[PDB]
């Protein structure tokens, strides 16, 4: 029984657990659209992280060799 845990799970109840079946139709759609868009942001953020490890490593080679 956590205060911040009980309140967190209530976000579903306040947003979903109360209304229409025809609105739940066009509401579960936009809930997946948000995941897909965030899953796309997460892919691009992972790819940029790969390129930075190369960018940083090349810098570590330059800073050393130029001393």
């Amino acid at each position: 029984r956590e205060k911040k845990k009980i309140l967190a799970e209530r976000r579903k109840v306040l947003a979903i657990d109360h209304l229409n079946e025809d609105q739940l139709r066009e509401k579960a759609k936009e809930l997946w659209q948000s995941i897909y868009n965030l899953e796309a942001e997460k892919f691009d953020l992972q790819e940029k992280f790969k390129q930075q490890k190369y960018e940083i490593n090349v810098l570590r080679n330059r800073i050393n060799d130029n001393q």
Binding site: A8, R11, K12, A15, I16, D17, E21, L24, R25, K27, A28, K29, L31, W32, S34, I35, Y36, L38, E39, A40, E41, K42, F43, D44, L45, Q46, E47, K48, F49, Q52, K53, E55, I56, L59, R60, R62, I63, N66, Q67
Partner: protein, 105 residues
Amino acid sequence: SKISASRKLQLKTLLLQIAKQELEREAEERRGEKGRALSTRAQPLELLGFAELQDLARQLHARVDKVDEERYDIEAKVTKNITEIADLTQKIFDLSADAMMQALL
């Protein structure tokens, strides 16, 4: 020099000419890699029973709160990399004719 500087320059231009193509080829590979990673991580929606249709919409709502946290954790890693990249780059940086031809001839 063993070869003419005109050939030396022609070869240098063709090296970047394909290195650009390998980059655009790399972008097309990354575009296809994303769509495949999105059909796996974001299996598209398809239908239900009005009662047990809801516990999936509840499951989607809980997914958004976790996906955005995973997106934040990787974002903050990219953010800290930007700080170090600019910091590392800071450290290393420390270490007429045609108007004449007409007015002459």
